[PDB]
Amino acid sequence: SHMKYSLSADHHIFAFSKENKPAISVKSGDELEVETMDCFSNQIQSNEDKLDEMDWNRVNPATGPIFVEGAKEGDVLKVKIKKIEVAEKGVLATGKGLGVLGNLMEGLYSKVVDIKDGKVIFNEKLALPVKPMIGVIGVAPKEGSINCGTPGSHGGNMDTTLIAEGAEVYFPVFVEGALLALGDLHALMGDGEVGVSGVEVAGKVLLEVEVIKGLNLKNPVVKTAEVTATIASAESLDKAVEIAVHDMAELFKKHTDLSTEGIATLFSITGNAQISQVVDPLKTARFSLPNWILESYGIRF
Amino acid sequence: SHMKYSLSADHHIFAFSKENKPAISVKSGDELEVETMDCFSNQIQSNEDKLDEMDWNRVNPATGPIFVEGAKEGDVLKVKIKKIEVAEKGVLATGKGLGVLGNLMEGLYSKVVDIKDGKVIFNEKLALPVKPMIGVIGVAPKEGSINCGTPGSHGGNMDTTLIAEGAEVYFPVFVEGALLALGDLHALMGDGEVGVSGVEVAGKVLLEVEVIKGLNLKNPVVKTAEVTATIASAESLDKAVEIAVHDMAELFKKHTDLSTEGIATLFSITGNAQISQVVDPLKTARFSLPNWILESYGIRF
Ligand SMILES: [Ca+2]
Ligand SMILES: [Ca+2]
Ligand SMILES: [Ca+2]
Ligand SMILES: [Zn+2]
Ligand SMILES: [Zn+2]
């Protein structure tokens, strides 16, 4: 299938749920240009008396859900991120009790910054080149309902910098049609997101979807032109690292002839545990390996 | 001063302690070529019979300590890593209960590998370009002895991939003459070190020492050609990351007029919380910023 649709940000959700009716159905191989609201549903723009006294129930709108025909529970949905465009301004936020330095601050803070000629004008001294990424993306979990802001095995709020143009994200599918949704673009974000926010922007994501049938995943996987990382989320970084490393060990166990000791020592010396974010109600980490090692071992998604 | 000394591996310690007598006294500006034995005092030189049933209290011998004239409690010692040479063989170790995948393995594993042509020969199919780094490097703590295998504010077994040629590590000074010692070189290791070990090798480090006055650090900092990262260790990765971020936030607070929220939001978008190791008695993490950001705010240790 080769169709292309545009889905506007008027179709959106707040919690990833098997019960959300689909905004649109497409087929494996189809493309979508998905428009998004920023993390705040665009409530903060007037920069001025735009205080974070927003609605708050309107945070993390994810555009979707998209129903992908052929996707069944146990399959994988592969999402190719081809293009991220971002708006010409963004919003930074932080404050008492928010992120790692929440203990040093009182009150709430927001600043709207300009993005101009591909740079975030943080202040008069730093113009910081954009690295657009998608903070919230995932499929419906098999059961119940999780706020767009809590990451899990189905993706969701992973705030992972590798999900950027050129990346492919693989989710395990828990329900018929997968139900993909995405929002919370950042013009720029550092690993850990230790202030609580990135440069929060509205924008548009050209992506493509494919259904994979032969492949069992327990958690999301992102693959860029150079590395492949398993992503996991848990109540502590330590446990989230453990889960991501084990998920990658399992892919080796299932797709290669390498002994466990082989696995553990290879990972020790060529894999990198890294951090995506530390400031959501679960923390998110990842274990990354270079593509050519996987390829050598015959691991192909 | 511009003397150059060579310090051989027969001068070494097993714990960082203010009580260990100096192997040698040097002055600020002097260089040393420092020989190390591996993490195993060289007790595994071959396979077959050479397995983990070594002397074990002879693990992580650090060469040193070096008394650096002029260094006083409260100063900072800067150690420029100029060259690292590694031996032509190294050892990989893992096994039951070791590192993140300990729960998958039975007994104890080691493999001795050839290092040749600039590559770890991991096995018949895979050769991996070397990236030498120093795993254990530190000064004496203020008070109680700390075994070589544990990291802390004095440094020690931080297993940080950034500590390589071209880097500078800055340590807070706890005792007169600082008492620097180093060892546990790795021909290659990935962040997290999740199998338990690096490519463990002996070798030789060309370094230079300088005493810095009027800089307050609470924990070490590494500066490479590209980034400057605070390093910290704790019983969880979550705390370690929190300490690293705070120590960086305090450098900014005390050396700039950026507000706390300026700091927090800047860190959120341009700083990277990163992992050094999760398998030692404490985990070590880091927080890294691009050098030109510190440079703009006139931050130079
Ligand atoms: Ca987010
Ligand atoms: Ca070590
Ligand atoms: Ca200040
Ligand atoms: Zn966001
Ligand atoms: Zn080591």
Question: What is the torsional sign of CA B196, B201, B203, B206?
Answer: negative
Q: Cβ(A113)–Cβ(A89) under 8 Å?
A: yes
> DSSP 3-state assignment of A54?
coil
Q: What domain count does chain A have?
A: 1
Q: At what resolution in Å was this solved?
A: 2.0
Length of chain A: 301
Cα(A101)–Cα(A103) distance, integer angstroms: 5
Cα(B250)–Cα(B253) distance, integer angstroms: 5
CA of residue B198 to ligand 5 center, whole Å: 5
Cα(B86)–Cα(B129) distance, integer angstroms: 13
Which position has the token pair 């929440």?
A102
- Please give the structure tokens belonging to residue B149: 């295998």
Cα(A262)–Cα(A42) distance, integer angstroms: 50
Cα(B214)–Cα(B216) distance, integer angstroms: 7
**Inter-chain CB proximity A104 and B249 less than 8 Å:** yes
Chain A residues with CB under 8 Å of B283 CB are: 238
* B112, B200, B261: best to mutate for the A interface, most A CBs within 10 A: B261
- Please give the structure tokens belonging to residue A43: 């409530």
B154 is in an annotated binding site: no
Contacts of B233 (CB under 8 A, 6+ apart): B150, B151, B152, B158, B240, B280, B282, B283, B284, B285
What type of residue sits at position A70? G
**Inter-chain CB proximity B94 and A268 less than 8 Å:** yes
> DSSP 3-state assignment of A1?
coil
- Please give the structure tokens belonging to residue B113: 């590998």
Cα(A42)–Cα(A52) distance, integer angstroms: 11
Q: Does A168 touch chain B (CB under 8 A)?
A: no
Cα(B240)–Cα(B42) distance, integer angstroms: 31
Nearest to A96 by CA among A85, A86, A107, A87: A107
**Inter-chain CB proximity A245 and B94 less than 8 Å:** no
Contacts of B56 (CB under 8 A, 6+ apart): none
The continuous run of DSSP H or E covering A6 comes out as strand A4-7
B190 → closest Cβ in A237, A261, A272: A272
DSSP code string of B147-189: ETT--BTTEEE---TT-STT-EEEEE--STTEEEEEEEEES--
Which position has the token pair 């050479």?
B50
Q: Does A46 touch chain B (CB under 8 A)?
A: no
Cis omega (within 30 of 0) for bond into B129: no
Give the CA diameter of chain B.
62
What is the distance in angstroms between the CA of the first residue and the CA of the last residue of chain B?
20
- Please give the structure tokens belonging to residue B28: 């600020």
**Residues spanned by the domain of A240:** 1-301
Tell me the technique behind this structure: X-ray
Cα(A188)–Cα(B267) distance, integer angstroms: 11
Residues of A (171-200) whose Cβ lies below 8 Å from B: 186, 188-199
Nearest to A283 by CA among B236, B283, B33, B81: B236
DSSP code string of chain B: ---EEEE-TTSEESEE-TTSPPSEEE-TT-EEEEEE--TTTT---SSTT--S-S-STT-SPEEEEEEETT--TT-EEEEEEEEEEE-SEEEEEEETT-STTGGG--SEEEEEEEEETTEEE-SSS-EEE---EEEEEE---SSS-EETT--BTTEEE---TT-STT-EEEEE--STTEEEEEEEEES---TB-TTS---EE-EEEEEEEEEEPS---SS-EEE-SSEEEEEEEESSHHHHHHHHHHHHHHHHHHH----HHHHHHHHHHH-EEEEEESSSSSEEEEEEEEHHHHHHTT---
Q: How many CA atoms lie within 13 A of A74 on its CB side?
A: 2
> DSSP 3-state assignment of A252?
helix
Cβ burial B83-108 (10 Å sphere, 16+ → b, else e): ebebbebbbbbbbeebbbbbebbeee
* A260, A261, A282: best to mutate for the B interface, most B CBs within 10 A: A261
A186 is in an annotated binding site: yes
